[PDB]
Write a protein that binds this ligand. Structure first.
Ligand SMILES: OC[C@@H]1O[C@@H](O)[C@H](O)[C@H]1O
Ligand SMILES: [Ca+2]
Length: 303
């Protein structure tokens, strides 16, 4: 494969879709390959105070995201993570702000926004020193374990694990801090992937920059239960940010996901073809955080 660069350079699209009437934003994207198409779920917010979730109809190419039907979910699954859990031939949708810290549901047809099972507990722990509590889960498995990573809007990244044979189920109520920094440097939206062709995992984490602009920092590990090493960890030399995105429609490069080689729990990405589906917003936007007009965009790594 292709080693991660020490300096990332991207090109970007503009906004790839506008929210369906009634929503002010589309956020926190999760995306899988599904029958040769892209299947995307997202957080929504309306014009008042309501968070929700949605999926898009599957679409073939990124120009079709703008016209793909946007399907409200009748059960809100904010900041979702979608994947196929191969060992039990079942799809899993993990999320937050349900009945415990994190939740999940299952389905045999992930294109159906309303086909998910009743809510199941994914994590029932609490964390110290956090205004939000646990936020922005992500999940990944290797040959023997499933792993849960999450943030706390507090400078820490947390990890829990279970034997893969016990999944789907709850990770319990305890977690291990695997990294800590200032609140702004390890803020939220972690995503963890296996790099195809390398004995290496990639973690990206959203950070808040010096003028409030959102960007991503990257870290690597050789084992999911091992230590993380800074890979691109400043605003001027980020994994992805205003410094290197090639995007003018947005300064923020915020909560999203890399395009994967598989839908399943191995969370594999091709380091020769990194692409980031992120949320961005017009630099002229402002006002209360919850009403910010986020939209999807796509970065393609230059090589
Ligand atoms: O979009 C809802 C939440 O806002 C942000 O703080 C999070 O990354 C996400 O969990
Ligand atoms: Ca996420």
């Amino acid at each position: 494969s292709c080693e991660l660069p020490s300096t990332y350079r991207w090109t970007s699209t503009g906004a790839l879709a506008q929210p369906r009437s009634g929503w002010v934003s589309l956020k926190d994207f999760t995306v899988v390959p599904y029958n040769g198409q892209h299947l995307v779920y997202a957080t929504t917010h309306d014009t008042g105070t309501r968070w929700g979730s949605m999926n898009f109809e599957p679409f073939g190419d990124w120009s079709q995201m703008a016209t793909a039907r946007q399907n409200a979910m009748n059960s809100p699954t904010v900041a979702p993570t979608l994947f196929y859990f191969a060992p039990k031939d079942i799809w899993v949708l993990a999320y937050q702000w349900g009945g415990s810290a994190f939740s999940y549901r299952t389905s045999h047809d992930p294109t159906d926004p309303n086909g998910w099972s009743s809510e199941q507990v994914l994590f029932s722990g609490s964390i110290a020193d956090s205004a939000t509590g646990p936020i922005d889960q992500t999940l990944i498995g290797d040959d023997t374990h499933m792993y849960l990573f999450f943030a706390g809007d507090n400078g820490k990244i947390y990890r829990a694990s279970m034997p893969i044979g016990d999944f789907p189920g709850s990770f319990g109520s305890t977690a291990t801090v695997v990294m800590s920094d200032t609140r702004n440097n390890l803020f939220e939206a972690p995503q963890v992937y296996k790099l195809q062709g390398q004995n290496r995992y990639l973690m990206i984490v959203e950070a808040i920059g010096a003028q409030g602009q959102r960007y991503f920092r990257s870290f690597t590990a050789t084992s999911l239960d091992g230590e993380w090493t800074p890979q691109a960890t400043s605003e001027s030399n980020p994994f992805a940010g205003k410094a290197n995105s090639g995007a003018t429609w947005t300064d923020d490069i915020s909560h999203g996901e890399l395009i994967r080689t598989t839908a399943d729990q191995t969370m594999t990405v091709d380091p020769c073809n990194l692409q980031l589906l992120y949320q961005g917003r017009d630099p002229g936007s402002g006002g209360t955080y919850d009403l910010l007009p986020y939209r999807p965009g796509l970065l393609t790594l230059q090589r």
